[PDB]
Every structure is written in C-alpha cells, then in structure tokens.
Design a protein around this ligand. Structure first.
Ligand code: HMG
Ligand code: NAP
Ligand code: NAP
Ligand code: CA
Ligand code: CA
Ligand code: CA
Lengths: 358, 425
C-alpha cells in the first residue's frame, strides 16, 4: 500500500510507526517543488532535497559570454569557477562530436565471424527496422548512424549502435530502437541467443575538447606569474603519475561540471560515469586535463564525453531546470556541452592555482 | 575586437559587487540586464531552503535546485531493516531498488575499512630513496606535529594512523597519510593536518621543495564489501529462475570484458548510491570519483560487482570506497539532510557506508534481472503509464485501470489519459 499512498499519507504512516520524528515530518512537508510534479516523477515520494544554486561568473566560450547556473552544497566552488574563468578570460572549442551509443550482445556464439558476416550483408534491413522502432527521431533529422561489430573471447558478440538523438540525452530513444532491432535478430537467428539490449553510457562519440591560452602574468597579482604556471604544469603532470592525485584532480573538475549538469536537470550519474571512465588512458586512471607552457602562455586543454541534454528527462518538467536554462541561454545540446566542458577546465585552473600558491 | 564579460553590467557602482549583493538584489540585477525573464525570477524566488542558510553555504546564491526524494523499501543489512531516503530525478530508480532488495531479502558485510588518505608531494627530488629513509626514521615527530596541527580530532579518538612513501619518475616523492576522521568526511581535518606537517618538512629540509599538500579523494582505505545470496527461484515470477541467474552471471562477466558495458553497469549502481549520498547531504562528486576509479582493476575499467552461481544460489558482491559522513559538510546545516538521516536511522558513518554499498548491489540486481529478462523498457513504460494516470487525476484503483488502457495505445499521452479517466467516472 505504501507505494499506492499519497505523499501526505506516507509521511503520516512513517510518523505513526515511529520511523520519523514529528520535527522530521514538518521538515519533509516544507517543499517548493509541486507535490504533483514530484510525486509523478519518482516512486514512494515523500519530500525533496534542496541544493543551493548560485551563478558562476566570467565564462566566455568561443567569444560568447555565459552566466553558469551551479547547484552545489560545497563552499568556494562557485567562487573558484568565477576566479578561474576570469583568469582564463576565454575558452575555445578544439573539436566536438555528438552521437549516442548502444549495444546488443549475443552470447554462446558458436562461430562469431559467421554471425557477424550475416549481419553486415543485411545492414539495409537493420537501418529499416531501427527507423520503425523510433521513427520520430528520424523525422527530426537524427536516427541510426552506424553499425559496428566486436567479437570477444568467451563467445560474446556485440553489435554496436551509434545514434544521433539531437538535443535529448537519448536513453529512451536508443533503448526503444535496440529492443525493436533485437526482435528482428531473434527472427533472423533462432539459433543464437541475445543476452541484452541496452544503451551504453560511455559516450566516447560525444567528446568535447576545450582549450585556453593564459598570459602567465594573469596567474599572480605580483611578479611570480611564470613560477605559478610552472608549478601548475608540474601538478597536472603528477596527476598522470599518481592516481591518488588524478582522482582528486578530476573530482575538482566535476565540482563545476556536476553543478551545471544538476542545475539544468541533466543526469549526474551518466556524466560522472563517462567522464571518469574516459580518464582511463593506457590502463591508468589519469587527469582529464593537460597543462603545458608554450612561451609566456599557460595552455590548458580538457577532453570529456558530455552527452548532455536540453530536452527530455528532467530538463523541462522541473521548473528550476527551465529557470537555469533561461539563465544559461544555450540554443542546443552541443552548445551546452561546450559550455560545461569549459566550466570543467576553468574549475581545474582555479584548483591547481590555489593548490600550488599556498 | 574583444569586449569585456557582460557581468560588469550587474554591479551597481553608483552605490556593490554581485558576490556582495543579497539574493534578492542578485535576481533583480539579473532581470534588469536581460539575463532572465520575470517568470524565471519568480520561479527562482520559490524556495524551501532558508535564504540565510543557502546564501552562506555557497557564493553568488540566487535560488535552489529541488530534487524529489522517495523511500526505498525492503532493504536488510546485517539482519537490520532500513528505510532508505533516495533523492533522484530518474523514474524507476526507487522502485527498482525496492524490487532488488526484496528479491535479495538481505545483505551482509564481508569486510570494511575506514581511513581517509592525504599526501604531501615533493618535486625536484635528486635521490628519492634517500629523502624517504631520512623521513621514515623521524616518524615519531611527524605523528606529534600532526596532533598539534589539529588536536580536536585526536581527543575525539582519531588522527594520523600510518605513513607510507612512494616515488615516481625518480624525481617525485609522495608521503601518504592514513587518517581516522571518525564520522566526518575528513577534508578539512586532513588538509589542516597536512599543511601543518608540511611546515616542519620545510624546516627539516630547506634543500627540498614541496609541490602541494592536500587530501586525496581516492579513499582506497574506506572500502566496504557487501554480499548477498539469493535462491535462484526468487529471480523470476515463472519457472526459469535458474536460467535468469545464469544470464545475470554472464552479464556481470561481460561487464568485465567490455568497458562500454561496465560504465553502464556501474552507472546503474550509482543511481542508487548517489541517491542516498545526495539525500543525506554528502559530497556526490567525491563518491563517484573514488568509486569509478576503484572500478579500474588490472589496467581495465570493469564492473564494481561480481555475480556467480553456487549450487541453487545466486551470489552477488559489491566492493566500493565510501568515505561517507554523518557529520560536517552539508549533513547537518541542510534541514533535509537531518530529516533524511532520521529516516535512514544509522548510528555512525561506518554503518552509512554499509547501507549505501548494499543499496548499490540491490540496484545492480534489479537492473541486470530486467536487462536479461523482459528488457528495461517494459518496466519503464508501465511506471510511465501510472505516472500519466496520476497526472490527470487518477485515484484509488483507477490508477491501474487507466494505465491498463494506456498500454493499448500506440502512444500514451496526457491528452488521452484524461479521456480514459473521464469515461471511467
Ligand atoms: C520497475 C519494476 C520494479 C516493475 O516491477 P514488476 O516487474 O512489475 O514486479 P511487481 O510490480 O510485482 O513488484 C516489484 C517490486 O518493485 C517495487 N515496485 C514495483 N512497482 C512500484 C511502484 N510503482 N512504486 C514503488 N515500488 C514499486 C515493489 O517493491 C514491488 O514489490 P512489493 O513491495 O509490491 O512487494 C521492474 O520492472 C524493475 O525492477 N525494473 C528495473 C528498472 C531499473 O533498474 N531502473 C533503474 C533506472 S534505469 C538503469 O539502471 C540504467 C541501466 C538499466 O542501463 C543500467 C544498467 O544497464 O545496468
Ligand atoms: N542507460 C541509462 O543510463 C538509462 C536507461 C533508462 C533510462 N534513462 C533515463 O532516460 C532519460 C533520457 O532519455 P530520453 O531523452 O530519450 O527521454 P525522452 O524524454 O523520452 O526523449 C526526449 C524527449 O524530448 C523530445 N524532443 C523535443 N525536441 C527534441 C530534439 N531536438 N531531439 C530529441 N528529442 C526531442 C522528444 O520528442 P519525440 O518523441 O517526438 O522525439 C522526447 O519526448 C533520462 O531520464 C535518463 O536518466 C537512462
Ligand atoms: N578535495 C576535496 O574534496 C575537499 C577539499 C576541501 C574541502 N572539502 C569540503 O570540506 C567538507 C568535508 O570536510 P569535513 O568533514 O572535515 O567538514 P567539517 O565540518 O569541518 O569537520 C567535521 C565537523 O564535525 C564535528 N564533529 C562532530 N562529531 C565528529 C566526529 N565523530 N568526527 C568528526 N567530526 C565530528 C567536527 O568538530 P571539530 O571542529 O571540533 O573538529 C567538525 O566541526 C565538505 O564541505 C567538503 O566538500 C572537500
Ligand atoms: Ca559500419
Ligand atoms: Ca536568458
Ligand atoms: Ca608504514
């Protein structure tokens, strides 16, 4: 019955059964998100978590000014972003891509190559079925983009689906498309077995690279601008050597990125999973940014998979997500990813500069 | 050309900088400079967290993000029943956690440690092996200064516990500090302790140079491992319980071969873990950072859980570093954190980490069972049909009736769910 009760009835049941105090109940009742919206978004809803939201300052991306909504519970995070962006002055997009990835995994595959060669010769029909399983995205101008195949040891075979989901995160688009094609596969190969069909959150085809060039004089109010830069460069390289520093290094970056992702109603677990997994380069967890000295300029670069969204999920139904989107005022998801990647690099600059200046 | 940033438009210099203004003044300035609409300003003004609390926690505060919070059910850890506060915006996460916990019935602790790491890193070290030995013999005084740099923790029963040393590139040296921060996360306890020990490191060695002294979020000494044992019959409403178990084992095994699946595998785990971390006012970045880095094993990003078959039993196990906290940070200054803490009803941070790890394993179970059984979509659409019913006003047993009819529709809507509801009345 608990999952069938109203929020008001669930709180009363919790109090009646001694599971929460009376003051705890009154606090759970002090909400600002409409009960209608919250109760229909999740299950067993009783209340809300309120995260303070502030405005990150001085971010410029490709000669466009931005005001960054940042939801965070940690002090100094928004100030660090603002000081880091002010010092950097601007950020420039080195390259951007935006495709989502999914997979259908066969198991107990007798001869992998046989199965794979079978699929490659019928790719036209697969694209046909993928359109039928979600035709709306194809009308918007997206849809399936490529098919890839990977044969693994232990008799696994993965069919990789790369999709253009436009401004959505794409989970429900990709999952629907994959389950529809899975049916066709089971019709084509009654012999074979399908372990699962699901989207991959490792969005290596949604990577964004930002960069910044900083006159070393801006790194200090005084004369030791180059000294601070040389130590920033040293700190960044040590992240490539000590995972115990790289994790803190990337955590500092995600303080800014996850604040914007949260404020705009995007999925924080998805972005945190892809970014940290993308940090694994050459079998070692390293930093997501590089800092080098080219003459009298400190040059920083960031590369992160940012399959973010401006539509779908919680980006619209939560009024605060719409308000944060009004403040940021990005026109599409690709732009959101560029702004978020710049926030990451700005956060990292403020963190390293403070780390080596003390 | 290169004009300045549009923020220097927000200052009221005829009087005040943005970071000095009050939240109300900061919103008025935002509206007057064309950055937000009137409706957006009013929505920002609709807040439940005290303005005095929010404004003094962060900088340039203007409003708040509201994440719905629900209650996960059926979780049992070490023969104790729990009600898990879960803060999330994703549908089905809480229902899946309840389903996964119900299927497993309970979780037990295999091992647990709780120590926060810190590091003081030397750079430009000529002979690393020399400086190291020069430090190992003076550990008696290193432990003493650590106590005076932050004595409060030592009288509460904690403080520095161990010192280890590593060298990289034959030019870097790192002094590793293992600290017991009790129920706090330990960031400010460690940092202050390390910056104080760095001082005498300079006094001792005017020859060497320190690059930085700071905590490490990679809390490999806060790993907690949870276990579960499920009769295969509980994995299906039908008769193929074992078949399902066999598929879950392979899905878990496949995660260990394809990082593209492992990331999604751990993402599902973190849907539950981060939802409790957020509800209790803990630092979500620190947990996801240490958890995903811990996922890297033998030079390969893999799944954080293992699933194996032992006779008629499906055996699941999770291992993650959870340096969570029950005090400090945002665990108390945020009233909702205290309310969520009253519901979870844990006594210490060690118990918090144990419950959160179990939540992760239960979450993993629900996802994997659905993926290898009917698929992830069927469950989602069903919850979506019920949500669309309550939106239009479905009550009582009309919730399932309207959801049943929405299933028949090729495309479910709020426009059509209202039509179904009115006919029933
Ligand atoms: C969604 C269910 C639970 C449907 O549930 P069902 O299969 O129809 O079975 P049921 O309705 O008879 O009851 C299932 C139990 O789940 C709970 N439950 C059931 N319905 C509700 C509800 N309305 N409100 C609250 N709780 C609910 C409830 O505890 C219930 O038992 P009971 O308490 O009644 O004895 C099932 O399909 C399921 O578990 N799906 C898993 C979906 C999931 O894991 N979602 C997480 C977000 S998606 C994700 O993780 C991404 C992913 C999957 O890609 C990660 C990965 O790949 O690993
Ligand atoms: N593996 C995973 O991690 C996983 C698994 C399951 C669920 N999820 C969750 O599923 C959600 C993300 O998936 P989703 O975005 O596809 O949900 P969605 O809300 O159903 O899809 C996007 C919505 O935005 C609309 N839209 C408007 N303009 C669009 C545009 N330019 N491009 C694309 N769509 C546009 C779409 O309309 P049309 O239908 O007409 O196209 C659609 O209704 C998140 O809540 C996520 O956390 C994640
Ligand atoms: N790299 C990073 O992640 C990083 C860096 C810097 C800061 N931070 C932030 O710093 C905060 C976490 O650090 P913190 O935990 O040390 O915050 P904290 O609030 O300063 O420390 C814990 C507080 O709880 C009190 N307390 C009561 N009972 C305790 C117990 N059993 N054990 C420990 N403390 C107890 C302590 O009293 P006493 O004062 O007497 O000791 C202290 O005031 C977070 O806001 C975090 O995001 C993170
Ligand atoms: Ca191809
Ligand atoms: Ca605007
Ligand atoms: Ca030792």
């Amino acid at each position: 019955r608990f999952y069938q009760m109203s929020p008001e009835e669930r709180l009363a049941s919790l109090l009646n059964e001694g599971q929460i105090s009376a003051d705890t109940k009154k606090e759970f009742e002090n909400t600002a998100l409409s009960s209608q919206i919250a109760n229909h978004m999740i299950e067993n809803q009783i209340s809300e978590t309120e995260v303070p939201m502030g405005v990150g300052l001085h971010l410029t991306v490709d000669e466009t000014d931005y005001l960054v909504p940042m939801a965070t519970e940690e002090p100094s995070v928004i100030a660090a972003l603002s000081n880091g962006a002010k010092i950097a002055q601007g950020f420039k997009t080195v390259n951007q891509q935006r495709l989502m990835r999914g997979q259908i995994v066969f198991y107990d595959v007798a001869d992998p190559e046989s199965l794979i060669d079978k699929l490659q010769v019928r790719e036209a029909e697969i694209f046909q079925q993928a359109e039928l399983s979600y035709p709306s995205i194809v009308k918007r101008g997206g849809g399936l983009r490529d098919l890839q195949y990977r044969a693994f040891d232990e008799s696994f075979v993965s069919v990789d689906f790369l999709v253009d989901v436009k401004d959505a995160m794409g989970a429900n688009i990709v999952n629907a498309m994959l389950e529809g094609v899975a049916e066709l596969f089971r019709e084509w190969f009654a012999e074979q077995k399908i372990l699962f069909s699901i989207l991959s959150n490792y969005a290596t085809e949604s990577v964004v690279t930002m960069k910044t060039a900083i006159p070393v004089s801006r790194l200090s109010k005084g004369s030791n601008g180059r000294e601070i830069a040389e130590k920033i460069v040293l700190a960044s390289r040590y992240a490539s050597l000590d995972p115990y520093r790289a994790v803190t290094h990337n955590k500092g970056i995600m303080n800014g990125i996850e604040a914007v992702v949260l404020a705009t109603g995007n999925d924080t677990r998805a972005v945190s999973a892809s970014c940290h997994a993308f940090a694994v380069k050459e079998g070692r967890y390293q930093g997501l940014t590089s800092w080098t000295l080219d003459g009298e300029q400190l040059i920083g670069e960031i590369s992160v998979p940012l399959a973010l969204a401006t539509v779908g999920g919680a980006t619209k139904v939560l009024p605060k997500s719409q308000a944060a989107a009004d403040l940021l005022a990005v026109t599409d998801a690709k732009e959101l990813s560029r702004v978020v990647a710049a926030v990451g690099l700005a956060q990292n600059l403020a963190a390293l500069r403070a780390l080596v200046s003390e």
